[PDB]
């Protein structure tokens, strides 16, 4: 269906400890494929997926040069934002940035992205029309006027309309076996007697990709979404994800509760009960 | 590929 490529950036200042720490990652859907850490013995854009090692040395030389330029620019922005907000130079501040593009099944662009944040709150972002900005405060409007005079959005619209969607299609083709093939979840239900008259039914969903999944319990036809303990989708570690939902069921009525799982890899939603 | 842009704030 719809696919996306994302690039995350994080810069945390280390006053007196040296250079600020810079960590950036790249994602195609929910799959990490590139990485660059400033605290590396030899910092270079490192691969994290098997279908990206196929690129030549000139590819990794550009991505490393670009990541190092983003690090040195973020290092200057950390000093600049101290003047915008009149903050002390002895405090640690965080600078975050994320840009990317979304494509649908037709291979065309759906939406471009470019957002920035300072100390966890929004700072300045590129609007959906790829031609205007949205500043969060008066200090962010200073950056807005400088980026509009330098025509920064003119390069962003060319990248998001062109280089972002074109390189995403070649990544989806080179990784067609992992990015375009969805892994259905492995489902099962466990029983845990909390007391002699009460029990808990837990519906499991393990080893699925992507992370988008919906676990909903139903008691003989009606959902108990309010009192269903659901945990956030967690990564298993091998590019797969896990999720479970639990309900406090009175003892003896276990066969009146059904679990419904929805995932893109399933042709139709599954229905599972305890099965003792 | 990444974005080739250098834009300080």
């Amino acid at each position: 269906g719809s696919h996306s490529m994302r690039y995350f950036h994080t810069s945390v200042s280390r006053p007196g400890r040296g250079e600020p720490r810079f960590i950036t990652v790249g994602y195609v859907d929910d799959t990490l494929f590139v990485r660059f850490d400033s605290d590396a013995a030899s910092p270079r854009e490192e691969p994290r997926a098997p279908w990206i090692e196929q690129e030549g040395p000139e590819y990794w030389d550009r991505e490393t040069q670009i990541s190092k330029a983003k690090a040195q620019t973020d290092r200057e922005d950390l000093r600049t934002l101290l003047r915008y907000y009149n903050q002390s130079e002895a405090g640690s501040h965080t600078l975050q940035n994320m840009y990317g593009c979304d494509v649908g099944p037709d291979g065309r662009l759906l939406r471009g992205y470019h957002q920035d944040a300072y100390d966890g709150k929004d700072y300045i972002a590129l609007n959906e029309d790829l031609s205007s900005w949205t500043a969060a405060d008066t200090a962010a409007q200073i950056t807005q006027r400088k980026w509009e005079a330098a025509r920064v959005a003119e390069q962003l619209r060319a990248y998001l309309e062109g280089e972002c969607v074109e390189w995403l299609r070649r990544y989806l083709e080179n990784g067609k076996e992992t990015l375009q093939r969805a892994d259905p979840p492995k489902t099962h239900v466990t029983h845990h007697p909390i007391s002699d008259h009460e029990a808990t039914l837990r519906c499991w969903a393990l080893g699925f990709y992507p992370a988008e999944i919906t676990l909903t319990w139903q008691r003989d036809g009606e959902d108990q979404t309010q009192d269903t303990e659901l945990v956030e989708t967690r990564p298993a570690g091998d590019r797969t994800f896990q999720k479970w939902a639990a309900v406090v069921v009175p003892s003896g009525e276990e066969q009146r509760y059904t679990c419904h799982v929805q995932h893109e890899g399933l042709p139709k939603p599954l229905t599972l009960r305890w099965e003792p | 590929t990444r974005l080739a842009l250098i834009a300080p704030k």
Epitope: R62, Q65, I66, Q72, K146, A150, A158 | L5, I6, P8
Partner: T-cell receptor
Framework: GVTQTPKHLITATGQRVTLRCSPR?????VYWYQQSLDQGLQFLIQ???????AKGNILERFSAQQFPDLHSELNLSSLELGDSALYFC?????????????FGPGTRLTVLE | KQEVTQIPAALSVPEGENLVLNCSFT??????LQWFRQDPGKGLTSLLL?????REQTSGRLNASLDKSSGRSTLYIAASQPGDSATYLC??????????????FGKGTKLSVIP
């Protein structure tokens, strides 16, 4: 907007010259270039807000510095025959990759025996 | 690693003919591509600034292209007037060292639009 001083320079081998440059009022970055016949326009050094930003294959006997008033100077010591070329000065608003640089008229240097 | 190249060295063309100036650059993290004209006395004056991801830029009778895959650029001059006679330099801003960008120029093509 970019001005250079002096305009022309005729000197002998082994001497020292000083090239001054005043960027635009709104520009915080200064660039130094050398245009010779054998290599064309070659980048020397770049200063941004008083500190050195980028540096090419500039020789050790070429000294430069940006002052707090954003104007730059370039001292070429122990001049040789090969140093006879055109020295341009450029400036930009900042470090923006989507913006352009603005060159000055250029200082022509000629070193003789 | 970075070495821009322009071909041909010189070009003398009668007035009114359309022109094409080629430019080739080496594979690097280019940030933009410019075309400068160099007049005697006056310094360099920018004509077109092609962004990193852009493939075309136009302004009047000037139309320049950019192809990072092949690493070539082409400036199209229409209705060659005697005022267009100057040296046309092909400049690119490539990522150099570690985090720095350096504007690299080509040898240049001197033009003489014979009226």
């Amino acid at each position: 907007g970019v001005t250079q001083t002096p305009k022309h320079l005729i000197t002998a081998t082994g001497q020292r010259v000083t090239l001054r440059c005043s960027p635009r009022s709104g520009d915080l970055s200064v660039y130094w270039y050398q245009q010779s016949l054998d290599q064309g326009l070659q980048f020397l050094i770049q200063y941004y807000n008083g500190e050195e930003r980028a540096k090419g294959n500039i020789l050790e006997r070429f000294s430069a510095q940006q002052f707090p008033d954003l104007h730059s100077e370039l001292n070429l010591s122990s001049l040789e025959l090969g140093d006879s070329a055109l020295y341009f000065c450029a400036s930009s608003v900042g470090l923006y990759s989507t913006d352009t640089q603005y060159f000055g008229p250029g200082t022509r240097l000629t070193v003789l025996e | 690693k970075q070495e821009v190249t322009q071909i041909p060295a010189a070009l003398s063309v009668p007035e009114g003919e359309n022109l094409v100036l080629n430019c080739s650059f080496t594979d690097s993290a280019i940030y933009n591509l410019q075309w400068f004209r160099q007049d005697p006395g006056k310094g360099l004056t920018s004509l077109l600034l092609i962004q990193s991801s852009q493939r075309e830029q136009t302004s009047g009778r000037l139309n320049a292209s950019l192809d990072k895959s092949s690493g070539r650029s082409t400036l199209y001059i229409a209705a060659s007037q005697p005022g267009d006679s100057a040296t046309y330099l092909c400049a690119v801003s490539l990522g150099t060292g570690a985090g720095s960008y350096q504007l690299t120029f080509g040898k240049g093509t001197k033009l003489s639009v014979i009226p």
